Amino acid sequence: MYYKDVTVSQVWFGHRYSQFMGIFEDRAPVPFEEVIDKINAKGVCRSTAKYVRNNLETTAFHRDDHETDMELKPANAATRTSRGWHTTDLKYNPSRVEAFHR
Amino acid sequence: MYYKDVTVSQVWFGHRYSQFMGIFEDRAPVPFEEVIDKINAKGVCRSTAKYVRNNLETTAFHRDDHETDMELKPANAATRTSRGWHTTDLKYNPSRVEAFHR
Amino acid sequence: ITMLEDHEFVPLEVYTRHEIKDSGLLDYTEVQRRNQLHDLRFADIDTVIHA
Amino acid sequence: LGRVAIAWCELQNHELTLWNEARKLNPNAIASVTVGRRVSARMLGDVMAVST
Helix, strand or coil: CCEECCEEEEEEECCCCEEEEEEEECCEECCHHHHHHHHHHCCEEECEEEEEECCEEEEEEHHHCCCCEEECEECCCCCCCCCCEECCCCCCCCCCCCCCEC | CCEEEEEEEEEEECCCCEEEEEEEEEEEECCHHHHHHHHHHCCEEECCCCEECCCCEECCCHHHCCCCEEECEECCCCCCCCCCEECCCCCCCCCCCCCCEC | CCCCCCCCCCCCCCCCHHHHHHHCCCCHHHHHHHHHHHHHHHCCCCCCCCC | CHHHHHHHHHHHHHHHHHHHHHHHHCHHHHHHHHHCCCCEECCCCCCCCEEC
């Protein structure tokens, strides 16, 4: 399975300390050309995910930066886990700025 | 299980009538110290939830008010239901103000 | 007159409980285990970023 | 069935005396039946002498 867990979160940065306001977790497919070229051959994956949700075409950029190809790396081994893989281990969250819904 | 059902909702308030735009339902853990002191001994619980989700520390204040120690009360008995407990029975929603995303 | 010979009845069953359980396409226990360990395996559930 | 077989062996070994007496009585018939073919027997003495 070659999918990109596109997740976006809206966060309230309060007058003193932060707070979530929703995390849209989504699973997104990847193009055949992406799988053939970057995944299988070069062992990397793009920072963007071009896919069709809700009868609309959308792309999400990892960390909301410009397009880049992260080096695909194995996932940390837990109990009774097969061989998985993921480009990113952490999850990007907006930088804290006062009284803004980021 | 000691968890706080942190639910936040964005509601459109039209000129004539209201409308939802998302309900971020979430289950949040509670600190060991909170369970030991306020839950087991005093039988109460805080109106806040200090927990780390999506690699970020977030809190939600019940009814978006200042922190208070809500009195835990038993849940209404339904069919084939064991003993549960919950501090709040209703769910807070923003007060209606015209043409605002509250 | 000849005595009836001793016979041993070995355990026999076309469908053991393991393969009967595996007959179903999806097992809720395995599916939930994989889906809930997904977050732990493919993300860090302990690292906290503050800025 | 083992009890039946034991009782049958005992029955044969026990009717052997009746069969000796019957040989002394009617040697022709007894010898014919024992052999399986109609034969004529004579004074056995201690063993039947037969003739087809």
